[PDB]
Amino acid sequence: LRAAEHPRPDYVLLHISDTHLIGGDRRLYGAVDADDRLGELLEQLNQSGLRPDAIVFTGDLADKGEPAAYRKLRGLVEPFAAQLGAELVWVMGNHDDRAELRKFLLDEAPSMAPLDRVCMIDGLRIIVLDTSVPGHHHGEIRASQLGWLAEELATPAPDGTILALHHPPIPSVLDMAVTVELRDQAALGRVLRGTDVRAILAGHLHYSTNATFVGIPVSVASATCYTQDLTVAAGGTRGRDGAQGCNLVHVYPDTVVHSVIPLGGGETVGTFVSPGQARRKIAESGIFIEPSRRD
């Protein structure tokens, strides 16, 4: 047998975003059951057998920063993360409330300080940055946050770094996005350029998009609740109950792969290949896949 072109990944992360849960049982904006949409996705991910190292939620967790929404989100997601053996990484969005998030999501004293955090998963560094501005919807990063980020990034991590934030430092194809985009991206660019940041995970746009920023790949996950219709009349915007899902992140020795996971379903087209049948077929094609360095 000959080795496939790439080994199994070093790390696997789920990248979920923009859950927008509300307290109680009403439909989000009277139009979509955000709990049901998120719940269906989590159940599908659970049934798939995926075993990620971490699950990262890139902001807009609660639509109006409601305590009851955070409690519900925690009750849905914590058992999911525990069942998958995954660490859980939460990020602020413009809809969240720092104090209520701390209290009800994190069991931490309420504070209005930016939710900026760092952790390690073995050799991989994850930095959480808070681009939210209390009482506002556009993104900003304070000078103090940039200083902190620069100091953290002064040395690299063995497997490099993933930066998780809400407002992405990239252009949007939707004109309305400019009203609420991350401001003064140049200042963040000066901090990030030349560092070991291998991926910037983001949300906010409610559609799947990717680019680079000062040479670093940016990956924006779409939303679990509702998404932007990119077939809208040019210049406009329409959110819709459709195309929800999340992203899967694979960290390899030499690259990071982002993949869009739409909600499961749709009638089968072509042959369904079971895991067992796939193992047989791959061997019959004369190939083996080299194990992960972290197996």
> Which range in 18-26, 179-187, 212-220, 236-244 contacts Fe ion by CB under 5 A?
18-26
- Adjacent-strand bridge partners of 161: 125, 197
- Adjacent-strand bridge partners of 54: 13, 87
Residue 21 in 3-state DSSP? Answer: strand
- What is the C-alpha to C-alpha distance for residues 192 and 146, in angstroms, rounded to an integer? 9
Determine contact, residues 226/177, Cβ cutoff 8 Å: no
Using the rule CB under 8 A, which residue among 163, 191, 200, 256 binds a copy of itself?
Answer: 256
Query: Using the rule CB under 5 A, is 96 a contact of Fe ion?
Result: no
Using the rule CB under 5 A, which residue among 93, 114, 139, 245 binds Mn ion?
Answer: 93
The annotation status of 18 as a binding-site residue, yes or no, is yes
The annotation status of 15 as a binding-site residue, yes or no, is no
Both tokens assigned to 18? 């923009």
The annotation status of 95 as a binding-site residue, yes or no, is yes
- Per-residue binder mask for a copy of itself (CB under 8 A), 31-60, x = binder: xx-----------xx-xxxxx---------
What is the smallest separation between the CB atom of 148 and a copy of itself, expressed in angstroms? 22
Residue 212 in 3-state DSSP? Answer: strand
Query: Using the rule CB under 5 A, is 198 a contact of Mn ion?
Result: no
Query: Using the rule CB under 8 A, is 88 a contact of a copy of itself?
Result: no
CA 248 to chain CA centroid, nearest Å: 8
> Which range in 84-92, 95-103, 109-117, 251-259 contacts a copy of itself by CB under 8 A?
251-259
DSSP-derived secondary structure for 88-136: EEE---TTS-HHHHHHHHH------S---EEEEETTEEEEE-----TT-
- Per-residue binder mask for Fe ion (CB under 5 A), 45-74, x = binder: ---------------x--------------
- What is the C-alpha to C-alpha distance for residues 16 and 293, in angstroms, rounded to an integer? 25
Smaller CB separation from a copy of itself, 103 or 183: 183
Q: Exposed/middle/buried for 291, CB within 10 Å: 0-12, 13-18, 19+?
A: exposed
State the residues that interact with Fe ion by CB under 5 A.
Answer: 18, 60
Annotated binding residues, written as ranges, equal 18, 20, 60, 94-95, 166, 204, 206
State the residues that interact with Mn ion by CB under 5 A.
Answer: 60, 93-94, 204
